[PDB]
Design a protein around this nucleic acid. Structure first.
Ligand SMILES: [Mg+2]
Ligand SMILES: [Mg+2]
Ligand SMILES: [Mg+2]
Ligand SMILES: [Mg+2]
Ligand SMILES: [Mg+2]
Ligand SMILES: [Mg+2]
Ligand SMILES: [Mg+2]
Ligand SMILES: [Mg+2]
Ligand SMILES: [Mg+2]
Ligand SMILES: [Mg+2]
Ligand SMILES: [Mg+2]
Ligand SMILES: [Mg+2]
Ligand SMILES: [Mg+2]
Ligand SMILES: [Mg+2]
Ligand SMILES: [Mg+2]
Ligand SMILES: [Mg+2]
Ligand SMILES: [Mg+2]
Ligand SMILES: [Mg+2]
Ligand SMILES: [Mg+2]
Ligand SMILES: [Mg+2]
Ligand SMILES: [Mg+2]
Ligand SMILES: [Mg+2]
Ligand SMILES: [Mg+2]
Ligand SMILES: [Mg+2]
Ligand SMILES: [Mg+2]
Ligand SMILES: [Mg+2]
Ligand SMILES: [Mg+2]
Ligand SMILES: [Mg+2]
Ligand SMILES: [Mg+2]
Ligand SMILES: [Mg+2]
Ligand SMILES: [Mg+2]
Ligand SMILES: [Mg+2]
Ligand SMILES: [Mg+2]
Ligand SMILES: [Mg+2]
Ligand SMILES: [Mg+2]
Lengths: 273, 131, 94, 86, 65
RNA sequence: GAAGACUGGAGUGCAGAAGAGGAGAGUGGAAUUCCACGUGUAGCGGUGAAAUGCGUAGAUAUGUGGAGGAACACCAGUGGCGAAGGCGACUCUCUGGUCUGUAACUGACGCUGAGGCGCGAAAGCGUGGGGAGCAAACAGGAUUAGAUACCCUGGUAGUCCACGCCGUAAACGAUGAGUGCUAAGUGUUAGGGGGUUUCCGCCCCUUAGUGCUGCAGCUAACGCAUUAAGCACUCCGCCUGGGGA
């Protein structure tokens, strides 16, 4: 659920958070952990190329299975855990082999269920199938774009895509953004919606809470100097004294479309958002 | 629900008088016996009979009309209702219609009319006015 | 405990070898659940009153059941909508 | 409450082997009904018309309990310890 | 003028009995009013549940050309 | 007040019946709109008359296909269900109440009910979706002495969904709830009994609803009249010249 906090202080006044009712265990699977090091937006050369990053709580990588290519082995859900590296939760699945791996937790996935992948899998929440074996109208997630590569298209918490038709070698999908797209029929997908739907209702409440997650402050361009930003300067507060609002590097920023005009995938996009 | 069985006796007679019905019958009770029996003593009702049944018995009353169809009873009233009971002392017993009517009083010596009560110096509950 | 009656329509361009493949399949999935089947009968080819899908005719089937948990009809309903062989179906209780 | 399920409760609380309208029998059956609606109302939260029928069972059950207490106290304290009431 | 189902002793109307139901709809598949067919009030209700059930399984047409 | 007894009140049992009563999940067909492609030429649309608007960048019309949302044609009925608000496509799951017959069972266990607790059309409010038609605000065209209107062309919130608020209406039968008594005539909904007849059908009696006409009675009059505004008993709510309010 969503947990409101009592207004004891001025920083806890508007703050809300999840209660983590779905999470089952608090210890990760040791043999599936890899180290991460923060980069703070620093380049290959050490330059700050993407700004407003750096300096949060330290985390550790949990290696996830997006390919889902273990076919014919019944996999049993063991726990549902917390992942700092993504908005959705994850589920630990240990197969009849003895092997264990993490997957994205779908909506309604509970401990004790059995999960299948392949061609003979049933259409149930958690199973992985090729897009040609999925009937029209089902809600899927974790769509992959090239066969054998791994899930990539719908993966954040509460997101879902819907199968929409067939065109021989391709399948129509209505992506979460509202886009209709053509994807090969030999690419896989998982049935269901993605786990943690309430994630968008959280009110951060504090500036320090943004700092905990790795976000440095954002300075507006109107309070800079003329050599710093196309908006800086002027005596007092100044309007946007230009034809259009501008990014820190020129290149208008409001309404100006930035997709390449000679793209090679314009023939696979049926209708844009 | 039924809160005043005596009032039903009083109003069933009144309802039958308007349409000149020659008889009526209604569920019996011990207290209704004297009230019905009293009315026969002063000629207010022409006859009364009892029918014995399983539940409580049944009583039918034969109404009385004069030659050329004039009512003998011109009105019935309940005084001591369940919502407000009334009691009368020996000297407080009234005279309904200046002695041309009667009042039924439930004294400690039985249920008897107003005229008889003043001859024994007893009071009680005033039940009905019949004129 | 409670009896039902199922009618479903199979696509007309289907062959005898593969027509009875789905009749025994849908008879099966009503059996491992809490039901005991009574009468599986087929009317035969009929002319549909309207063009429900790309087809115009179809094979009609009748099934009678005595179910208790009333979930074997759920499994039938779930898997009937998903197969390309059944074009319509209906469950009736009396 | 299915018909055969009701007839087991009746047979389990009869004061003698024939009656079906004893206050002991009626309360036992009424108790079973409100312990069955409470699950329906719990999940079907916005079913207000059915919830009114619940409150007419609770009031009716309370009326019978009050009558039993006045008439015979010893019987009354036996039911509440057996049905788990207050 | 006379109820068909009452006179014939019919107590149940089936939606699979297309030949019986075709006598109770107009040329365009519309259910005839009760003052025309003469059927009783009780069995007019049962009759329409049968027709509406059969329309969905394409045994009778919704609208007929 | 206390001790017993009874079954006409009340409730349970047993056998039937009807119903758009409620909540959840899924599915169907007409129709409007938008999109893509054939055919085709100069108007379409609109009004009391017009004009704004759409159309040669090829519309309106027409044939084919796709997407999406909302309401459910005939049945349909002073018909039905519910305490009121209200409930109309189909199927299933979970649930509430009512009517009829029987006389097995308990034996007054009942009625009303200030404070209290719940439900409660539409508009409106908060958060997240959805958005086809309709449409406050708004824009343009007409009408008019003027026209911040009626009329025409467009159109945003809203109307739809989930959860949480709000607590009002000509929320009306302008008629509080319970009980009993008091001419008839005639439709209709759901049952039961009897006579005719092989059935069907006709007739009579009876229970619970729903309409019309009318006697006594009531009313200032209009009118009500066994579904009383008649005759009675119990409990609750409310009123005491108009404005201010
Ligand atoms: Mg930024
Ligand atoms: Mg800022
Ligand atoms: Mg400065
Ligand atoms: Mg500059
Ligand atoms: Mg400037
Ligand atoms: Mg400045
Ligand atoms: Mg200045
Ligand atoms: Mg009774
Ligand atoms: Mg219903
Ligand atoms: Mg409903
Ligand atoms: Mg259509
Ligand atoms: Mg003119
Ligand atoms: Mg066109
Ligand atoms: Mg009612
Ligand atoms: Mg029920
Ligand atoms: Mg029901
Ligand atoms: Mg009724
Ligand atoms: Mg006895
Ligand atoms: Mg009450
Ligand atoms: Mg109150
Ligand atoms: Mg509203
Ligand atoms: Mg809103
Ligand atoms: Mg919104
Ligand atoms: Mg104007
Ligand atoms: Mg418009
Ligand atoms: Mg609401
Ligand atoms: Mg007001
Ligand atoms: Mg008011
Ligand atoms: Mg109304
Ligand atoms: Mg009022
Ligand atoms: Mg009254
Ligand atoms: Mg009355
Ligand atoms: Mg009547
Ligand atoms: Mg004054
Ligand atoms: Mg005043």
């Amino acid at each position: 659920a969503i947990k409101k906090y009592k207004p004891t202080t001025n920083g806890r006044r508007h703050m809300t958070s999840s209660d983590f009712a779905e999470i089952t265990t608090s210890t990760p699977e040791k043999s599936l952990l890899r180290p991460l090091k923060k980069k703070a937006g620093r380049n290959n050369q050490g330059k700050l190329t993407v700004r407003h990053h750096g300096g949060g709580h330290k985390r550790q990588y949990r290696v996830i299975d997006f390919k889902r290519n273990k076919d014919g082995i019944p996999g049993r859900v063991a726990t549902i855990e917390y992942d700092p590296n993504r908005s959705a939760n994850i589920a630990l699945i240990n197969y009849a082999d003895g092997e264990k791996r993490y997957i994205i937790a779908a909506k309604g996935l509970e401990v004790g269920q059995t999960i299948y992948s392949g061609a003979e899998a049933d259409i149930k929440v958690g199973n992985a199938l090729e897009l040609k074996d999925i009937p029209v109208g089902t809600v899927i997630h974790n769509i992959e774009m090239k066969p054998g590569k791994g899930g990539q298209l719908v993966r954040s918490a509460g997101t879902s895509a819907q199968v929409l038709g067939k065109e021989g070698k391709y399948v129509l999908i209505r992506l979460n953004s509202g886009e209709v797209r053509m994807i090969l029929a030999t690419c896989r997908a998982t049935i269901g919606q993605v786990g943690n739907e309430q994630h968008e209702l959280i009110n951060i409440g504090k500036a320090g809470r943004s700092r905990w997650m790795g976000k440095r402050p954002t300075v507006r361009g109107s309070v800079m100097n003329p050599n710093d930003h196309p908006h800086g300067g002027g005596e007092g507060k100044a309007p946007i004294g230009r034809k259009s609002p501008m990014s820190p590097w020129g290149k208008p920023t409001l309404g100006y479309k930035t997709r390449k005009k000679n793209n090679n995938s314009d023939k696979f996009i049926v209708r844009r958002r | 629900v039924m809160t005043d069985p005596i009032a039903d006796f009083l109003t069933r007679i009144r309802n039958a008088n308007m349409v000149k019905h020659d008889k009526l019958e209604l569920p019996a009770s011990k207290i209704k016996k004297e009230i019905a029996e009293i009315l026969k003593r002063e000629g207010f009702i022409r006859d009364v009979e009892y029918i014995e049944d399983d539940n409580a018995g049944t009583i039918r009353v034969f109404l009385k009309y004069g030659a050329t169809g004039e009512r003998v009873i011109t009105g019935l009233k309940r005084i001591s209702k369940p919502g407000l009971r009334v009691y009368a002392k020996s000297t407080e017993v009234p005279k309904v219609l200046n002695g041309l009517g009667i009042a039924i009083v439930s004294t400690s010596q039985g249920v008897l009319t107003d005229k008889e009560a003043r001859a024994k110096q007893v009071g009680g509950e005033v039940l009905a006015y019949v004129w | 405990a409670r009896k039902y009656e199922i009618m479903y329509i199979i696509r007309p361009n289907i062959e005898e070898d593969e027509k009875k493949a789905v009749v025994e399949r849908f008879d099966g999935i009503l059996t491992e659940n809490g039901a005991e089947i009574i009468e599986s009968k087929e009317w035969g080819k009929r002319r549909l009153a309207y063009e429900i899908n790309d087809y115009r005719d179809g094979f009609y089937h009748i099934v009678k059941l005595n179910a208790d948990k009333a979930d074997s009809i759920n499994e039938f309903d779930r898997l009937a909508k998903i197969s390309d062989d059944i074009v319509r179906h209906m469950v009736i209780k009396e | 409450l299915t018909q055969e399920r009701k007839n087991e409760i009746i047979a389990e609380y009869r004061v003698h082997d024939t009656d079906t309208g004893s206050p002991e029998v009626q309360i036992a059956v009424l108790t079973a009904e409100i312990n069955s609606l409470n699950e329906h109302v719990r999940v079907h939260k916005k079913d207000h018309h059915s919830y009114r029928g619940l409150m007419k069972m609770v009031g009716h059950r309370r009326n019978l309990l009050t009558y039993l207490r006045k008439k015979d106290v010893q019987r009354y304290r036996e039911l509440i310890k057996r049905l788990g009431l207050r | 003028k006379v109820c068909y189902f009452t006179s014939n002793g019919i107590t149940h109307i089936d939606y699979k009995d297309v030949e019986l139901l075709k006598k109770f709809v107009s040329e365009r598949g519309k259910i005839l009013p009760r003052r025309v067919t003469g059927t009783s009030a009780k069995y007019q209700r049962k009759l329409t549940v049968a027709i509406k059930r059969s329309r969905q399984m394409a045994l009778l047409p919704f609208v007929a050309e």
